[model samples]
Target: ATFEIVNRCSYTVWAAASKGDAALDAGGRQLNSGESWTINVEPGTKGGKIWARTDCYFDDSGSGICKTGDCGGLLRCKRFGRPPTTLAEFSLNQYGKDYIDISNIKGFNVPMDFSPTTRGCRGVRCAADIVGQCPAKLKAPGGGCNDACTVFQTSEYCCTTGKCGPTEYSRFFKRLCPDAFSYVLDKPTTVTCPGSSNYRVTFCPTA
Candidate 1:
């Protein structure tokens, strides 16, 4: 598996990737403006998530914390990062295709563009300025926007109960990032392509 990670934001972004119980690129690195990096994954890697961490501080030993999406504060994150961050999720070679999506159900921290480099696949992107437009109730402490489920922790907002559906909070995200996963059971957010294709995940993509 392979992915091209690009940073289009003005500032630096710490790119992180995780697969199942293993960290794909554990020692997350910073990408300056307009810089891009390629991530290589073992074949048959099934499920994983990719995200960008902002407002982070790491010592020379590569141990520090991130205001958003901190993964145990270790250079090589041994676990998944915290929430209030955007995500690009994927399942490679599952059912003969690669399942992919950009998700905001956990909230939005940065703009994202997920596109395939090969044919036979459609791209999806969520480049909205959601952090700037986040509601007061769902605003994160440092940066980024919080999901209603993270703020209210209610069954309605979280869709944790029986036969749940979209609420106003979910609609708020959906309106801005129509192609992203705005809430649980958001079936339309996902897409599939040939597993052999390479993908590109860009942060702060221009319109």
Candidate 2:
């Protein structure tokens, strides 16, 4: 499968993607608003994730910290990014199909649009003003919003054990973006499309 990641945010976005411990796209790169990057994920790639980082400042050597989605304070991420970062996850050619989801289980930093460009599948979007309207307990210091699991880190909030249900904090996310995976146990957010479908992940989608 191929992914075309576009930045539509009003600010800079450091995009990152990974399937294994190894970095994809040299770990990551900078994208100004209206810029984009296209990445091809070989068939059968599994457990892949793509996210955007904000409030980042990287030197020529590609080292820095971001207010959200910082991966070990480096521009080239060797692993998945930190929490409060919106994720567009993918499992290409898994079980003869491609699985996808717009997940907010960790938390939300920027609004996103995840959609299929071919093979006829519906799109998923979480464009709510989550940062501006973040609840007091979930608000991050600079920007973005934290999930209950990141903040409270309990069985109920984290769903670390058993089939946990949504709490008030999870509901806060779900109410704004019903299509996103607001919590770990959220099943309906998962969608399967044809095996070779192409996809687009846009940050700060206006519509």
Candidate 3:
């Protein structure tokens, strides 16, 4: 399967993804405005997640910091990017279908669109203006909104215990981006499509 990552923001972003033991086509890479990168993944890929790091500056030795979603300062990420950032998550070819979603469970930075290039598959996206109107208590220092779980840390907000549901904070996110995952048990956000379809992920998509 292939993932085409398109950057539609005016500024640059460093995109990264993880595949556990599978060979990653693009573990970490920089894309200037309007640029795109392609990542090829093995069939039946599972537990794959992708996100973009913003406000970064790196030297020749690849040492620097990302204001958001920094992954240990490495050009190539060895783990998941930091929270308060948007996530594109997937479990491909599982249970006879492919599952994908744009997740704000970690938080929201750049708006994202996840779509299949092929015909007959539905697309999902979150293009809301989250940063400009983020709630005061849920705002992240670098930009974007932080998830309630990160800010509150209570069982009610974090859903660490049994049968937790949405609070006002989660509802705020859901109201703006109904297509995205706002919290745990966000089953409605999951999109199922043909496993063989090539997918595209766009950051800061234009409408």
Candidate 4:
């Protein structure tokens, strides 16, 4: 007897390799469902986990970002830069439009540069440990808006309160690269904590 798998969703999926003694997870290239690629094996091959994941890498290889199913919307690649002063201020340099559609976009890094102008947080819950104040350079890939950020949260270097005194000025990606997918997380719900806690974040476009 044989079992069949279907895509069900819009996008394709990656089929992980077989399991082993060490329990290491192995997977192979992606296979679009509906268009099946059968595997001829013994009636009772083995039991393992068949996961449908969508978090893929972004490089110069194959397609852009891959999703198991049609992402709730579009798979957007966001560019987090300085928070704009007004709705008519934000900008999306060049590379900004490189990956994602001009529409769907979100920041994996700090939603928005810390700010008090009621345009921070973007759309996320900014808790403690987040650095800066009203419009302060929000968190980015590396560390400081310009510095290198800590790698993973698995080590001692996790999400810690940012140092430096209150805002003497506002900063972030002061300048935008010609080829950046930059956008603003417009008017978000205002949030405030203790100490370096009060922040005003927002999202863009749809905002």
Candidate 5:
């Protein structure tokens, strides 16, 4: 599947993608407003993700820090970057289909649209101005909003060890992004498409 990425934020952004242990686009790349990059995913790649970083500064050697989604201060992320960061996750060619979802399980930074480019229904979106309404206690250092799980890290917020229901914060995010995953136990947002379906991920989407 081909992963096409677009940046619509007024400022610049660094986009990142992970396919299991490998990093797509050499981990990440810079995207100015209205810019886009496309990545072709190898078939059967599992546990894949695409996200963006903000306010980043990197050296020629690719060592840097991104305030919103720094992967341990490395420009080439070896693993999933830190949150709060928005996510478009996928598992391709699983039993002749692709499973996809948009998750705020790691929290929220930029708005996103992840959809099949050529066919299928509309897409999944986490395109809310959550930063402006994030509870003071759940706000990240830069401009993103942290989830209850990231902030509290307890069974109640994380569902780590016991039966848990959605908290006020999770409900708050769900109110804005009901079509996406607001908490770990969310079940209805994930969708399926035919194998080899290409996808597009748009950041700071306007529509």
Candidate 6:
């Protein structure tokens, strides 16, 4: 299937796709903003997963912040990305909102309304450090969410700590790619996450 990614945010998006095959485990090529690419899931072409990351934001991959040289390890490292407007497995239509389902394509689209006064319907309960405050490490260029992570409302992000839970990520992977979701390599061998925060849970579209 073809992987069609779009940038619904006011800013641009940077993305990368990796062949799911074990041979291409090194990493995938990075795609620039406002650009869409396709991957042919054929023999010798890995279909692991693709990444739509930003320079400042990080996912739970535990690689973006790995000091031990094992960024691909199982521990939740920090990579970068805006509020994933859409981690779709298929291609987007001309308007970029509707999905023109093709016979061999499989994916979805996520778009965000670029509004300043928007809040979330979910709650993001972080530690005292990031409870009512935004972290310096979470900052992005075009005013993205500087706290937790979530995939609701804006595709880029907001001010609240709208974190995506393990269950959410797991279920997200399952719903999108049931037979190909791979867990972290070795689990966290060391404590990589900082702050007075140990464990946090938040929601999207804050209420």
Among these predictions, the greatest TM-score belongs to: 2
Q: Give candidate 1 misplaced runs (Cα > 4 Å).
A: none
Q: After superposition, how far is residue 94 of candidate 1 from its true place, in Å?
A: 0.5
Encode model 1's per-residue lDDT on 162-200: one tens digit a residue.
667888888889999999989987767788889777889
Pairs that clash in candidate 1: 26-76
The number of clashing residue pairs in each candidate reads 1, 0, 0, 32, 0, 31
lDDT string, candidate 2, 57-175, tens digits: 98888888998998888898878888899899888888789989988888999999999999667878999998888899899896899999999989988888877998899999999
Index of the highest-lDDT prediction: 2
**TM-score, per-candidate, Cα-based:** 0.94, 0.96, 0.94, 0.23, 0.95, 0.27
Q: RMSD for all candidates, in order, please.
A: 1.5, 1.3, 1.7, 18.6, 1.4, 17.4
Candidate 6 lDDT, tens digit per residue, 104-172? 011112221111111222111111111123234433233332222333333223223444233333333
Is 4 or 5 the stronger prediction by TM-score? 5
lDDT of 6: 0.26
Supply the TM-score for candidate 2: 0.96
Superposed model 3: Cα runs more than 4 Å off: 20-23
TM-score of 1: 0.94
Model 3, residue 73: distance off in Å is 1.5
lDDT per residue for candidate 5 within 112-153, as digits (tens), equals: 989899786568888888888888898987779998888888
The Cα error of candidate 5 at residue 62, in Å, is: 0.6
List the lowest-lDDT window of 10 residues for candidate 3: 18-27
Which residue pairs in model 5 clash with each other?
Answer: none
lDDT of 1: 0.85
